[PDB]
């Protein structure tokens, strides 16, 4: 995503040190190494599958790549443990949301389009006690579910969907993605099940905002994001560059306000572009 | 913790549920 733009924003140079906080499939890390291989790059991801790809990459690039497995909230401890001082990095990249592995693997439970266990945990099986999306929709009460769908999913029909979920789970536990998708569609007339931007575009399933809401909750993505941003700021050197890619308004709003220092003259705001993602880049002063 | 949803309180509700399911 925006690979030419991200790399151009980071402007990597010989001898510089980078932190890729969202290694994913390695797309951005490999594009950085391709523009400049004489760097050090710390590659972090909370997802075992992505971290393993970074480890595999580190065998091709042993001097350059250090793979780490952890959440944004864990990054500071992982870095300090690796001997990285604050004020080290020339650039930090955050490409937010989901990887292709998570969305294209039915068993991970992220897609309404492919049936699988309603898991949705970005951490995979790393934390067996971490609640799944099934645990969320099976345990929480109606007003809690409605608050999640409204706040994290911006879903206007939060209450009607939350009621549908509690009704449905009373009959039988909600354990799989297509099951949940059809329970959500049930709270609407059969005609409203698909939305679309215009007459020619792809049908989008009505449960799409509910799935995003569940994913953000299960993975604590917005609270995690704020912690990752503070960690990015602490570990950047002055003059180092932060590049963030946002894919919905809630994360973009958190990046915007963090950069303005009005979460409650620290950054030079050098790029705002959409590409769908919104890229924001900034230089630490 | 910070975005209007109390993850700690809600997680504890879920963990009681998961213990009941054991
Ligand atoms: C949009 S994908 C990044 C894809 C990557 N840039 C590429 O080119 O393939 C987001 C990745 O960041 C990870 N991620 C999302 N939130 C995270 C968090 N709070 N802590 C650590 N990793 C996170 C996901 O696990 C996923 O692998």
Author numbering:
A (entry chain A): 6 to 269, 304 to 314, 329 to 338
B (entry chain B): 1 to 22
Cite, word for word, the article reporting this structure.
Similar to other members of rRNA methyltransferases, METTL15 has a two-domain structure: an MTase domain (domain 1) and a scaffold-like domain (domain 2).
To further characterize the interactions between METTL15 and the C-terminal helix of hsRBFA, we crystallized and determined the complex structure of METTL1570–407 with SAM and hsRBFA226–260. The METTL1570–407–hsRBFA226–260–SAM ternary complex structure was subsequently refined to a resolution of 2.2 Å in space group P 21. In the ternary structure, METTL15 formed a 1:1:1 complex with SAM and hsRBFA226–260 in an asymmetric unit. Most of the hsRBFA226–260 (Leu236~Asp255) were visible in the electron density map, forming as a helix and lying on the side of METTL15 domain 2 surface. Superposition of the METTL1570–407–hsRBFA226–260–SAM ternary complex and the METTL15–SAM complex showed that the η-helix (Thr339~Glu361) of METTL15 domain 1 posed a physical barrier with hsRBFA helix and was not observed in the ternary complex, indicating that the η-helix of METTL15 domain 1 is flexible, which may undergo a conformational change as a switch when METTL15 binds to hsRBFA. The helix of hsRBFA spanned one hydrophobic surface of METTL15. The side chains of hsRBFA Cys237, Ile239, His241, Asn245 and Ile248 inserted into several wide and shallow hydrophobic pockets of METTL15, resulting in specific recognition between METTL15 and hsRBFA. HsRBFA Lys252 contacted the side chain of METTL15 Asp209 via the positively charged side chain.
